[PDB]
Homo-oligomer: A and B are copies of this chain.
Amino acid sequence: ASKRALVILAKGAEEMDTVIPVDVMRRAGIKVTVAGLAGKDPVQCSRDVVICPDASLEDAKKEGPYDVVVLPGGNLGAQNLSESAAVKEILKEQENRKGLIAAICAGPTALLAHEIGFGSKVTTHPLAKDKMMNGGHYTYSENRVEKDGLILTSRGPGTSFEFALAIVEALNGKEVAAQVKAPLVLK
């Protein structure tokens, strides 16, 4: 069957960090659910782009499990993800079932908040490094995309294509990732 992705969308999310992975994953034939943290209502992203989620997180979490859970960045978005009990439960379940978790920019700091994937090598946006590294629970990387087993992280809007294609490769393989990449006119 087709692989399934859950993208958790909170107020203040970085819209580029959100839309590039959603679009690229759908190009890869992944069934993507854009789930609104706060409900079914439109979400005001960090640069004021307003995105209508496919479902509330409350509803989407009942339609699990997912082959990947994706956390976009944006400082305020990531803080909302970090403060959410529902997000904690979803991430802990995904970790327990050995499923992929992918987070970009400030997004990985939600992994710290929910005590997910300690001991992994991770990257973040450079400005989010100190928050991520508080307590030394991860090892930091400056790679544009970092994958330590089932924890996949990346740095920012400018690494969003690389991040998305890494998710595609992890779920659907190298050939599909290459086929999806070519029409994008990347470097």
Contact = CB atoms under 8 A, between A and B. Distances in A.
Interface of A: 14-16, 19-20, 22-23, 26-27, 34, 42, 46-52, 54, 125-127, 144, 155-159, 161, 183-187
A158 B160 CA distance: 10
Contacts of A187: 158, 187
Contacts of A23: 14-16, 46-47, 49, 157
Given A50-B52, A127-B183, 8 more contacts: A15-B19, A15-B22, A16-B20, A19-B19, A19-B49, A23-B46, A144-B185, A159-B185
B50 A51 contact: yes
Contact of A158 (B19, B42, B184): B184
A47 B34 contact: no
27 contacts: A15-B22, A15-B23, A16-B20, A16-B23, A20-B20, A20-B157, A23-B47, A23-B49, A26-B47, A26-B48, A27-B47, A34-B49, A42-B52, A48-B54, A49-B51, A50-B51, A125-B185, A126-B185, A127-B183, A144-B185, A156-B183, A156-B185, A157-B161, A157-B184, A157-B185, A158-B184, A187-B187
Contacts of A47: 22-23, 26-27
A158 B186 contact: yes
Contacts of A185: 125-126, 144, 155-159
A27 B158 CA distance: 14
Query: What 4 A-B pairs come out closest when comparing CB atoms?
Result: A156-B185, A158-B186, A50-B52, A158-B184
Nearest to A186: B158
Contacts of A27: 47
A20 to B, nearest CB: 6
A164 B165 CA distance: 22
